[PDB]
Amino acid sequence: SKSLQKPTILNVETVARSRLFTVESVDLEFSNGVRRVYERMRPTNREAVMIVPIVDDHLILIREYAVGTESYELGFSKGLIDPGESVYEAANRELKEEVGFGANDLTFLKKLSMAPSYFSSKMNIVVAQDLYPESLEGDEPEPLPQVRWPLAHMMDLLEDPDFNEARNVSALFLVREWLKGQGRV
Amino acid sequence: SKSLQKPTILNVETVARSRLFTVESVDLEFSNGVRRVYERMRPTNREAVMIVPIVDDHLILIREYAVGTESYELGFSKGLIDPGESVYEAANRELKEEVGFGANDLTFLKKLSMAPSYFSSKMNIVVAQDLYPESLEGDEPEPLPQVRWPLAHMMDLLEDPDFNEARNVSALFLVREWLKGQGRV
């Protein structure tokens, strides 16, 4: 039983590079002397933002095609934070490009890591309230159908496999704890 | 006024392959005739399993090195389901290899996807109870320190950045809901 000593990095090499993906090979030497080679996604400081808009006791969810699984996913609007932007700025911009609304009340609820064994990306969860119409051109290939989901039946979302993705589910439970906080359940 | 119509896959092509990563380029034609090229991880039907062992009103968490972030994450044991194994079989085996316990009571709580845009893999969350000592040989380079976390304070885990990752957080909330169900909160 001793302190958690990080393995030491002996070498890093780019093993594969696609247009959007760049995978590195990492040579490690753990504290017990074992040596091993890991493969990961080249670390980035680029963070993500996820917006959870609430309007008349309803959740504004969107339908978006996902090529990974080749199907339509039902969930919260997600986007990248631009260099220089704050979580609030980015959340308001992305809401505007995908949903067509801006929010006067944006609260930053949590920052989640995403599969740290291979990634180093961060996900910021923002709740959007007091909405107003305003559009920005996003780069979407097709329109994103919106779905209004009652807050009183939020939990029913867990019965829809199109929604059951770790980010959405984490956000749904985090938003509900927050709503519990001020009894808007 | 029209139903969703999935894009047609024009062409799939391996664009990059490392020793654990195979990226594909996908040519897509959306319903509106818009054509686009997306990149993704080669789809697999290989599923994952995540075990949440509970012993004396305590959660058995583990500390594991993540090369993506170069740090030790605090969380639940995760592993692959080998071809042929059921969720129960895989959960019991992986618990034995990583923590040294098998379990008489395994419950399959929920299945989730992780960023379906690029990945297809799904994760099965399994709660393990009624443990018995039994150790199997895994592929870990260093032993995984165990942490007993009181169920009376599970929600305190959200205060630890080492644990705040979408899979862990989802698991935490779903297990607490399951616990709520029978009042062992």
Type of residue numbered B102: G
Work out the number of other CB atoms within 10 angstroms of the CB of residue B115. Answer: 24
Asked if the C-beta of B44 comes within 8 angstroms of chain A's C-beta atoms, the answer is no
User: Which residues span the domain enclosing A80?
Assistant: 7-185
CA B157 from centroid of its chain's CA atoms: 17
Asked whether residue A118 is domain-assigned, the answer is yes
On the 0-12 / 13-18 / 19+ scale of CB atoms within 10 A, A10 is: exposed
Asked whether residue A183 is domain-assigned, the answer is yes
Residue with tokens 């996913």: A73
Work out the number of other CB atoms within 10 angstroms of the CB of residue B25. Answer: 17
Residue with tokens 């309007």: A55
Could you tell me if A95 and A51 are in contact, meaning their C-beta atoms sit under 8 angstroms apart? Answer: yes
B105 DSSP β-pair partners: B129
Enter the tokens of residue B183.
């009042």
CATH number at residue A85: 3.90.79.10
Residues of A in contact with B16 (CB under 8 A): 16-18, 21, 23
Asked whether residue A159 is domain-assigned, the answer is yes
At what resolution in Å was this solved? Answer: 2.7
Of B68, B118, B123, the CB nearest to A43: B68
Asked whether residue A180 is domain-assigned, the answer is yes
Asked whether residue B2 is domain-assigned, the answer is no
Asked whether residue A135 is domain-assigned, the answer is yes
A169–B170 C-beta distance less than 8 A: yes
Type of residue numbered B47: E
Residues in chain B: 185
Asked if the C-beta of B156 comes within 8 angstroms of chain A's C-beta atoms, the answer is no
- From CA B126, how far away is CA B175, in angstroms rounded? 9
Cα atoms in the Cβ-side hemisphere of radius 13 Å centred on A80: 9
Enter the tokens of residue A5.
């000593």
- From CA B161, how far away is CA B47, in angstroms rounded? 26
B39–A19 C-beta distance less than 8 A: yes
**Dihedral angle, C-alpha A87, A88, A91, A92, nearest 10 °:** -150
For chain B, the domain total comes to: 1
Asked if the C-beta of A39 comes within 8 angstroms of chain B's C-beta atoms, the answer is yes
CA A40, A43, A44, A47 dihedral sign is positive
Asked whether residue A178 is domain-assigned, the answer is yes
- From CA A165, how far away is CA A121, in angstroms rounded? 16
- From CA A168, how far away is CA B5, in angstroms rounded? 23
Instruction: Give the technique used to solve this structure.
Output: X-ray
Q: Of A22, A5, A2, give the one whose Cα is nearest residue A14.
A: A22
Asked whether residue A54 is domain-assigned, the answer is yes
**How is the beta sheet containing A101-113 ordered, strand by strand?**
A77-80, A48-53, A122-133, A101-113
- From CA B70, how far away is CA A120, in angstroms rounded? 9
Q: B96 in helix, strand or coil?
A: helix
